[PDB]
Specification:
Two copies of one chain form a homodimer. In chain A, 31% of the residues lie in helices and 31% in strands. Chain A is α+β, with helices and mostly antiparallel strands. Chain A has a five-stranded mixed sheet with strand order 1-2-3-4-5, with helices on both faces. Bound molecules: acetyl coenzyme *A (2 copies). Chains A, B: Pfam families: Acetyltransf_1.
Chain lengths: 137, 137
């Protein structure tokens, strides 16, 4: 079970993982050119776990020079409950802290009941009830 | 009324503007080293307006390779209602779009009644009622 940085050549394996994971919504930004630019901008910040040449978990992460933003946290069903998500999260947050990023955010759809439950259970995170988000249309 | 890119040398003027503007909360990340690293990561994406050698308006912006994030939108009280915030917004969004960033976010405190009113009035933005935000503690 090798934890390592995601690189551009991982795109087919990660896109396949995302595609087969209920609860992960694929969008335009998940396609190769966006992935390539993301990794060039955020090198070493996104992580995956592989075993026997297969990718079994991932966490995409990056920052804007002020805050961290994490996306597409996945552990394959066969490898859940082993602490892999927590392992990736601890490592991403450490790397972000090295780069001067002391606060990070995740966005979770209200309709994603299982994801909400996961994030409410992480004691190092808090659901924000003090802010509104406005986004471009 | 000259609109231009913010550079590192603008820190004293911008910090002074932020400091004298009710509704702008100053934090650690507003100090010079964070500002310097932010501008290196996001060159030309933050803007200011100056007239007669004085900075009268600003908008800080950046991105993580996936989404845009804007903050510290300010127009000096003597120059409000002249479209300066809209001018900066249009230009930042255009520059973000050139960089492949098609969706941007702002976080606005629930208690910030005037800022909420401003953002609700921008027809190119929408208040999100479909997501929860979790942040590191
Ligand atoms: C990425 C976003 O911003 S939202 C999208 C989140 N991802 C998904 O919804 C994809 C589908 N789900 C998954 O891939 C997995 O269920 C994950 C990644 C959420 C969790 O994977 P796991 O292997 O359970 O995580 P891990 O074992 O590291 O969990 C850390 C702790 O969180 C807690 N936890 C995990 N899942 C849940 C849950 N659904 N509800 C409450 N608490 C949970 C557990 O206490 C766990 O400790 P453990 O190791 O003793 O079980
Ligand atoms: C940065 C964030 O994410 S939140 C923090 C926002 N910033 C602040 O609260 C700092 C204090 N406030 C300010 O500096 C200013 O009042 C600003 C920047 C919010 C607005 O400055 P203004 O000079 O009004 O900007 P501008 O004229 O470009 O406003 C655009 C339009 O928004 C609307 N608008 C502006 N302020 C408000 C308001 N308080 N309520 C409702 N609508 C408004 C108007 O329709 C205005 O039309 P106009 O372009 O014809 O003038």
């Amino acid at each position: 079970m090798q934890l390592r940085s995601v690189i551009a050549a991982d795109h087919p394996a990660l896109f396949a993982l995302w595609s087969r994971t209920p609860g992960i919504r694929l969008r335009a930004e998940d396609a190769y050119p966006f992935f390539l630019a993301y990794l060039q901008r955020n090198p070493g910040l996104s992580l995956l776990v592989e075993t026997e040449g297969e990718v079994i978990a991932c966490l995409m992460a990056g920052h804007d020079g002020r805050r961290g933003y994490l996306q597409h946290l996945v552990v394959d069903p066969g490898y859940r409950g082993l602490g892999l998500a927590r392992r990736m999260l601890d490592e991403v947050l450490a790397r972000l802290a090295r780069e001067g990023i002391g606060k990070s955010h995740v966005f979770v759809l209200d309709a994603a009941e299982e994801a909400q439950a996961f994030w409410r259970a992480q004691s190092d995170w808090e659901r924000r009830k003090d802010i509104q988000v406005f986004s471009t249309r």
